[PDB]
Design a protein around this ligand. Sequence first.
Ligand SMILES: [Cl-]
Ligand SMILES: [Cl-]
Lengths: 308, 308
Amino acid sequence: ETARWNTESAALLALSEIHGVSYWTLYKVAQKGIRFRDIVTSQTLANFEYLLGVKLHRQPYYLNEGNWSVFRDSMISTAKILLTHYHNSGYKIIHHGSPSYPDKLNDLSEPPFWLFAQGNVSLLDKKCVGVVGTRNPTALGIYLTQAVISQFIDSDYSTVSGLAYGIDQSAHEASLLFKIPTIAVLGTGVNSNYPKNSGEMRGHIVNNGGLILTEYLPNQKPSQENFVRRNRIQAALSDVLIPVEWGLKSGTSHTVRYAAQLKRAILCPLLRGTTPQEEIKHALSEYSATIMNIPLSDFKDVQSLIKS
Amino acid sequence: ETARWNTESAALLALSEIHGVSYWTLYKVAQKGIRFRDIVTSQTLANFEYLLGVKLHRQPYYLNEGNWSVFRDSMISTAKILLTHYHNSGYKIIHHGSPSYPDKLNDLSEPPFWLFAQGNVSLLDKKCVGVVGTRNPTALGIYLTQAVISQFIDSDYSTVSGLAYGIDQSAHEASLLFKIPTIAVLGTGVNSNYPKNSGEMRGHIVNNGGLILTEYLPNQKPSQENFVRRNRIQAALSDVLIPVEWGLKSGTSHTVRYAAQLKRAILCPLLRGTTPQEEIKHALSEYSATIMNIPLSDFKDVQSLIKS
Ligand SMILES: [Cl-]
Ligand SMILES: [Cl-]
């Protein structure tokens, strides 16, 4: 069974890394039920380009009948070693339709048809709580992030965030601090160094039983489109979504909307004694969200301790 | 009534700032019930030095009968303006035996006989929770400090700490963030810039209804002896003492010991699922301390919200 998916893995890397096929091109290929293995084993360039869904080239073209066999065989041979190269770094490619693929992602209209993974894949199949927010939080947003995640200590939950500046990085840092496994869904390929000084955090995430996850091909750069596209994954994986600090018509609003479309539970942190803002009121109105008081405790619980 | 204490204030400043009398010398003076006003109005140097408790000088000495009147009158005149100078900066001098002096400090064997104050003095008479710890905390100590103080939101408590690097600064920063009035007890005189970038925090403390407090004379530098001496104040003011992160045979252990001697309530933060350390076990053994779980909430309270 292993060898079937490894052949599809190598075909994906062949088209992506060697021939440079776009994410979108390969996505709609897989969306149609076309397997990359049968694209790379095409015996003509016409067949190649038909299955790949691009505009067929006329003559003259540098790819032709005279050099097709080597073009095909050399790319298959190249990609087979390239996958062992990525396996050696601890990366796994999880394909849609395989046993390792998590059910939750098939709630999406556009499920990822492949995933690059580094770390503990079994977390995708277990309870997850998304913690996400602005890349430019206030001091209180940073605290609420940690306070929220501390509530899940010794639960069966892991955390999910996007490894981005601000709330997301504070979410991962908090999960690590409290020894909650955390999942980072990237807006890049696995090879990128974004965000700054990310290689150590990714290391600690993996060392603490966490997971690095991305739908994007190894060398895909960060982009505003890549982030919004990735947030459908974050919403789908989040059994509960907790947007800590966020404005409407923001990145995180997309995630919250998606979570509402996916009928995920939505909790909104509110510090004791403070007034909900319209983004919170929006979530209670639209998405049937729920306030989560921080602290959840009352001061009466503190009084019990002081005066025994 | 105001003018009686202002005269004692000016006499204290006269001896301290003009003539350079030590903290300890003036402390034992006041400990005996000698008022500084009557020292500065002494008509001989023999009387001056007898009341001040120092070794009486023989002749020849530059202070003598021929220049005594001016020495006395010029220092009284100088100090009267010097107090208006400190009043203008918002400083108040609170004397032991005056209505503004807080009762809690008379639980000390060695109560401060004067206090310099900037901000809201009425906090000393109300519920206070001390939050103190090492100057070199771990990441978790910094969080626990904030989590502990968040429990007192919308309580009638203010916070008390020593405005020192580490836990103390995180305690003040947390109180400010959650809008809990905070009291900083200095290990210096009010004129010092210690610790680094302290003038803005002192400003925000005062602007948020907080208080700066010190027993030390205006230009007293920081010292390890000044810090341990000041922690008897912090213990006395703390109706509840919460040492967040601390080793035994540390600065903060002195405070905790004192708090035990003063029979203050002692709470010790313990993150959920973690084992008490011997410093915590020491406090439960000796000082009848109590664990305060962080969070105080259970995960069952989170489950209630998720699945309504
Ligand atoms: Cl596929
Ligand atoms: Cl006095």
